[model samples]
Target: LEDKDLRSIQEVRNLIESANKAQKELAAMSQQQIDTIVKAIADAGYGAREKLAKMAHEETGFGIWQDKVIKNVFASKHVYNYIKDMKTIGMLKEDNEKKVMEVAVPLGVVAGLIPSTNPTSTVIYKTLISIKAGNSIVFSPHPNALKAILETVRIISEAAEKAGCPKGAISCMTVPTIQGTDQLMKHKDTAVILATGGSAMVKAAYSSGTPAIGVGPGNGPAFIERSANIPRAVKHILDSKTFDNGTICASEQSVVVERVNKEAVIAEFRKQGAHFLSDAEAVQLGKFILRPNGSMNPAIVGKSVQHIANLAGLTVPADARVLIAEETKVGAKIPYSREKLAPILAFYTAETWQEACELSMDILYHEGAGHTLIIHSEDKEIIREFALKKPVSRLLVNTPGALGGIGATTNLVPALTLGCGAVGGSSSSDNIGPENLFNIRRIATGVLELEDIR
Candidate 1:
């Protein structure tokens, strides 16, 4: 009803129209030409990685600038390296036995929803992957990260155009609104939506009557099993939680230790600058984690321990890298049990590995089902047991969850957008990449006639 809302809607319509036209041109290009444009976009994004990181940090006040820089590099350079050899533009696979040829098919236009936490990196990753699959993407930037998203889109789109891509192939809305985002999602030309943000936004994308790949929230608990190296496991968890102040969805939300190893784990955490909150302090800080509506408080997201301490009117060591609270319950009302994207973790003790496994499941089901979970163990049997039983998409082991879940420290596909399977209410279970953005059209030759069958 407001003028601003109307303008945003109009802008969304215009961008979609242009993107559709551009996608057709992109679809006609050969694999070589498409690769050229994708490479240029990646290189350009990599070149401006530091600048974009600074911009995102300053604009949104979320996460560390240096860590954001690494994220941008990962999004651009690492993603490019991983996807460069992939054949996404033309014939993908040929089988003589089956008499089938699998050819790539562009999906046309993609609607990308950027998150505030990783604006520039997500834009760079989404643009590269989308275009590699011969689709044009129009981004709907989060309101808090508008400037960073706009600049990233401009840099990548210009580079793509200079590399012989069609104009308007990569565009973003300058005026982003809930109405405008809805228009983009429900637009008829939109082939699919690549949504990354809060559960509400992802749900909206799913409900928009359009095909979508959305991620669910992650409340993954790192279970340090009896067979694990206590010191190293503690190090990985701390490194993950402290990285970028824990903005990543895959970062561990809680620590679960078997009773025998609880003392050693606590000692290691304390040695590495983790402050275990007193019972009274946990209650004091719990109220600030979620707002009155039970949504995560933006004030606590991606903030440092000292900053959060100040916000909660609690005093802690200045050198504290993270805050830990002891929690035994898992529910909507339990702040520590849910996903808190800050340098805060809940600690739980279990008598057995089976109990730890169940505890982790309860945490994920309460909030982050089908997202990710971390298990630090030397026992292959225990690891496989957790993997087979857990509802999570990725069961990261022995490495930092934030890094391992995204394939930085693991063999999983390198991707900025991670997909949760049906259990998590998502369409795909893969780490989304160019392969996920397009469809594979198969050409099958008839090997047998009706007479032969008869």
Candidate 2:
């Protein structure tokens, strides 16, 4: 290996040793003690929300700074609110009469894989969840967003230590290399990997001989049923797509509307400042949506409608919020059919909800099979139909996939990392939280097991 790569690998090894030692102390703390440290970490991260958000946007050139602030708050306050009262230390449950008691078990040190998109927010969220479960986390940041990720680590780490958490409970490498991340994932002392980047990284995490909770790609389709509220549905879709310029992977990628409702849906999208691209513009823009490897092109991942249009040498109105590409096909070559992480959407029409469901299925199976799906309908039967038949892990109803999928606008646990489940090649299907970070140990008293069986 080269000298730089060798240095990164060595640093990763050192961090793992330090984190291992820190996690031992953390694992012994009572729930109350752990909660104090966790809260302090959250507050410190939350307090510097604006700075981190601006830093991430400036450093990465991805997403909006203001939106990053909202994301930071969600990761810090919302996550802390959700996890503060949970039992993650010592005994979680006991049944004296039944002779069983359950104790929480920390997984020790965790290797956190941070993506360039949603960098700071993911850092805050992953660190909070890791420490909440009494585990120390070593972050492997995408090289593009290392500064912001490291800053977040320092803020949370300082507060955690001040609140009595062990030193090195949270850390990030200044020099991040694939080899170093590999070292972190494959280390014997590393208990688990919290993989949150692309599919390849997640696959590496799983193949590294370490347990992992990795999320799959998102090619989520939003189906607008015939009976849906066109205006409301369109509004939610726009809000979702425009939020952070659609950097969020769970954001809607395509809109599947019934033929009967298609015109109205199109009208509402236009009325709400969404420019439906002409066939010519669609063709021009589609060519640049994906790279030769069939993955999304980073150039347009989080750009606004005007910027994307300009990139294609086209012009959109000043008020345009999104670019909609009218599409019919679903495949790798059809760029719009795949996930466009920017404020661009593929539009498709079907004759019936049944056809719409099938089309959505085709779109998902082609790419994002086990990620998330959205259904907008007043008809409970249609909603249930899609929910039951969809291959996605989360079937959202009348909600924006980006906000709803992350539990921001819904009752689901607010999280930055979303899982695609076994169907999508992931280990856990839930929005990752402290609950997924620890194991449970059960103590049961045998009261005549053999005789009882007889």
Q: Highest lDDT, which number?
A: 1
User: Relative to the true structure, how large is the alpha-carbon lDDT of every model?
Assistant: 0.92, 0.89
**What tens digits encode model 2's per-residue C-alpha lDDT throughout 1-454?**
5499999999999999999999999988888899999899899989999999998998988888889999999999999999999988888898999999998899999999999889989989998899999999999999999899999998989999999999888988779888889999999999999889887888898899989888998999999888889999998998888999998888999999888787788888989888888998888887767678867678897787878888878888989998888889998888888878899999998898888888898998888988889989999988888878999988888898899999998898889889989987889889989999999999999888777899
Q: Write candidate 1's Cα lDDT for 1-454 as tens digits.
A: 4599999999999999999999999989999999999999999999999999999999888899999999999999989999887889888899999999999999999999999998998999999899999999999999999999999999999999999999999999999899999999999999999989988888999999999999999889999999998889988998889989999988999999999998899999999889999999999999888678988778998888899999999999999999999998998889999988999999999999999998888888888889999999999999999989999999899999998998888889888788888988899988899989889899999989999999
- Evaluated against the true structure, the overall lDDT of model 1 is 0.92
- Each model's number of backbone clashes? 0, 0
Model 1: ten consecutive residues of lowest lDDT: 288-297
Off by over 4 Å in 2: 449-454
For residue 425, give model 1's deviation from the true position in Å: 0.6
Cα lDDT of candidate 2 equals 0.89
**Residue 63, model 2: Cα distance from true site in angstroms:** 1.1
Deviation in Å, model 1, residue 191 alpha carbon:
0.3
**Candidate 1 Cα deviation (angstroms), residue 363:** 1.2
